[PDB]
Amino acid sequence: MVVTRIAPSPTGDPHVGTAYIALFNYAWARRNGGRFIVRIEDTDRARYVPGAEERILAALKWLGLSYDEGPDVGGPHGPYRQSERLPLYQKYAEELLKRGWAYRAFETPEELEQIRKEKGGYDGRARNIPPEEAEERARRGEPHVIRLKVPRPGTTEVKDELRGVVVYDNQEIPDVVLLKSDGYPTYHLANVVDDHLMGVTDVIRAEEWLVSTPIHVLLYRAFGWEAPRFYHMPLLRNPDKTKISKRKSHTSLDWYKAEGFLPEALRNYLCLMGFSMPDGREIFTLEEFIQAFTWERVSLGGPVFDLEKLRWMNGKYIREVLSLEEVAERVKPFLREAGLSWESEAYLRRAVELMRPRFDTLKEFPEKARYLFTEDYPVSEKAQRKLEEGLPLLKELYPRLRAQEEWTEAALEALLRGFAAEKGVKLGQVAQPLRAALTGSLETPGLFEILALLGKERALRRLERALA
RNA sequence: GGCCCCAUCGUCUAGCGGUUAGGACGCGGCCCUCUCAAGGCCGAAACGGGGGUUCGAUUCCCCCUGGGGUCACCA
Ligand SMILES: N[C@@H](CCC(=O)O)C(=O)O
Ligand SMILES: [Mg+2]
């Protein structure tokens, strides 16, 4: 059938490029009733960041993907972490040795650098070491690596399902290291051994791996295995069109979650990086995307990741996709983080409802509506000025307000409309200064709902401190 | 620099020989309105250049230019 996989390297924060590629793998697998695997590719102890693995696994789940096999969900072809499969690569590297498809090389990293400086790349000089001598030097413990013995001269065909066939000249393919001197495999060796053993049939990955594909075609040949299909997705880009990077863009999934972007929205945006619905619709579910996915609709240009459009979309989910109650639940962590509390569920829900069309990220909610949860709020200069100018009519309104028995948004509107009328002034002349009194801002939701929200007592108490 | 991939508004894109080249973000204007938003309407904004194929290129081919990727005992 169809088996796909995402194979993150635990060497930094959970990367958006990873979610992006994971998203297309997951969809292609489901669209085909196949399997979607997670394989942790921790073969480089130097760049290994302890804790990175858990973080990428949590971020994929957070984003909404599920995998069928992996480190924390089991599966028949585990382990799913390459550091625990060392003996396997070891074994396969040696089998290549016997088949005549690899050779041992003993140069120190220093000699290699020098070789590279003189000829710009390893010259395969170790191919000339007599096999029996190489074997003996190995038994004596002399440190070495095992390299791919590329067939020279020659030609190697790679087929990418989206771009067609590309024919590399073997002179462009290096005699790559397959097993390092510390006994760890390089990415090239492990990737082929594990995709095979875990049965992957469809390799969907970022374009940055395209030129390394001919090295993999050869390894599959060397082992006598059937190569899988290859689909290379365009790289996500920084605004300057270079591959998205930590210094020109936000590439950490943790940053996005911390900033209050909903996983559903981030996920919906990533689908738009290379894919589009037939009918041109832009807001759709994870499930709908799976059902409509087709490689015929994947475009190959490198998409600039636009934060502004992501925010637009996040605001769109907040106001049109999630329910009022869902938004209220998700806003809690940010209120907590801001050190604010809500009196009750009822209160929080109404507050979130009044602000729904005014925040594009969950983090923005506590910021723009701080006055709705604490007395410790800021009063802007423009608001303070509007307040001062309207103090006279506010003082004249106060008594009429402490008299209003029915504190409702309809009652209050009628009360204030009349007062402005009887005062021959425009409602705004009375609404704006009151808004400033109640919120310390001139940019808020409707005055009547703002006035109704806290109840007569709390409202006047605040109005009073302003008239003080 | 060698090799490889890519090419429609500033950005994400629709288009698979004939369209007033469409949508979305962002930008501007208007409407709504107690502020700010949200929403609605209108608007400005693209086929990189040169050859060919063809009755007819945004679309098929070549070159160029442009952009990107890749050349580690990193992934
Ligand atoms: N570990 C590789 C895996 C890429 C692949 O072959 O899918 C990475 O950087 O994601
Ligand atoms: Mg136009």
Structural domains present in chain A: 1-70+187-237 (3.40.50.620), 71-186 (3.90.800.10), 238-322 (1.10.1160.10), 323-370 (1.10.8.70), 371-468 (1.10.10.350)
- What sign for the dihedral angle of Cα A89, A91, A97, A98? negative
CB-based burial of residue A33 (10 Å sphere; 0-12 exposed, 13-18 middle, 19+ buried)?
exposed
First to last CA, chain A: 76
Alpha helices in A73-212 (DSSP H): 86-99, 109-119, 131-139, 187-197
The question of whether A246 is a catalytic residue gets the answer: yes
Confirm or deny that A245 is annotated as ligand binding: yes
d(CA A120, CA A237): 29
Task: Look at residues A68, A58, A46, A66 and name the one whose alpha carbon lies nearest to residue A13.
Answer: A58
Angle CA A38–A216–A243, to nearest 5: 65
What is the identity of the amino acid at A269? Answer: Y
What is the identity of the amino acid at A147? Answer: R
Structure tokens at A164: 């067609």
Structure tokens at A80: 């799913």
d(CA A227, CA A365): 51
Task: Look at residues A63, A54, A58, A68 and name the one whose alpha carbon lies nearest to residue A19.
Answer: A63
Structure tokens at A278: 């037939």
d(CA A17, CA A253): 9
d(CA A10, CA A41): 7
Structure tokens at A330: 């998700």
Task: Look at residues A228, A156, A232, A160 and name the one whose alpha carbon lies nearest to residue A195.
Answer: A228
β-partners of residue A202 are: A229
Query: What is the number of the ligand closest to the CA of A17?
Result: 1
d(CA A360, CA A123): 56
Structure tokens at A414: 């009628």
DSSP assignment of A341-374: --S-HHHHHHHHHHHGGG-SSTTHHHHHTGGGT-
DSSP assignment of A160-178: ETTTEEEEEEGGGS---EE
Q: How far is CA A63 from the centre of its chain?
A: 7
What is the identity of the amino acid at A321? Answer: V
Query: What is the number of the ligand closest to the CA of A24?
Result: 1
For ligand 1, whether the C-beta of A209 sits within 6 Å is yes
Instruction: Write out the E strands in A283-429.
Output: none
d(CA A180, CA A275): 39
d(CA A391, CA A430): 10
| H-run or E-run covering A394 | helix A381-403
Residue given tokens 């997670």 in the structure block? A38
In terms of DSSP bridges, do strands A145-148 and A177-179 run parallel, antiparallel, or are they unpaired?
A: antiparallel
Task: Look at residues A255, A278, A265 and name the one whose alpha carbon lies nearest to residue A309.
Answer: A265
The structure was resolved experimentally with X-ray
Structure tokens at A430: 């009375």
Residues 38-67 of A with CB under 7 A from strand B: 41, 43-44, 46-47
d(CA A468, CA A463): 9
**CA-CA distances (angstroms) from residue A374 to A40, A187, A303, A368, A378?**
46, 54, 43, 12, 10
Local structure of A59: helix, strand or coil: helix
Structure tokens at A239: 């605004």
CB-based burial of residue A463 (10 Å sphere; 0-12 exposed, 13-18 middle, 19+ buried)?
buried
Local structure of A158: helix, strand or coil: strand
What is the CA(A205)–ligand 1 centre distance, in A? Answer: 7
Q: Enumerate residues 6+ apart whose C-beta is below 8 A from A114.
A: none
d(CA A273, CA A244): 13
- Residue with the smallest CA separation from ligand 1 atom 8 is A8
What phi and psi values does residue A312 have, to the nearest 5 degrees?
A: -55, -50
Task: Look at residues A159, A204, A160, A162 and name the one whose alpha carbon lies nearest to residue A296.
Answer: A162
**CA-CA distances (angstroms) from residue A324 to A96, A299, A351, A452?**
61, 36, 10, 19
For ligand 1, whether the C-beta of A9 sits within 6 Å is yes
Local structure of A379: helix, strand or coil: coil
| H-run or E-run covering A458 | helix A447-467
Confirm or deny that A246 is annotated as ligand binding: yes
Task: Look at residues A429, A298, A321 and name the one whose alpha carbon lies nearest to residue A20.
Answer: A298
Residue to mutate, A49, A187, A213, ligand 1, most ligand atoms under 8 Å from C-beta: A187
Task: Look at residues A239, A226, A156, A168 and name the one whose alpha carbon lies nearest to residue A196.
Answer: A226
In terms of DSSP bridges, do strands A102-105 and A145-148 run parallel, antiparallel, or are they unpaired?
A: antiparallel
Residue given tokens 């028995």 in the structure block? A405
Asked if A142 contacts A93 with a C-beta cutoff of 8 angstroms, the reply is: no
| H-run or E-run covering A419 | helix A409-422
For ligand 1, whether the C-beta of A191 sits within 6 Å is yes
d(CA A406, CA A456): 9
d(CA A115, CA A55): 40
Q: Enumerate residues 6+ apart whose C-beta is below 8 A from A86.
A: A183, A184, A185
What phi and psi values does residue A165 have, to the nearest 5 degrees?
A: -90, 140
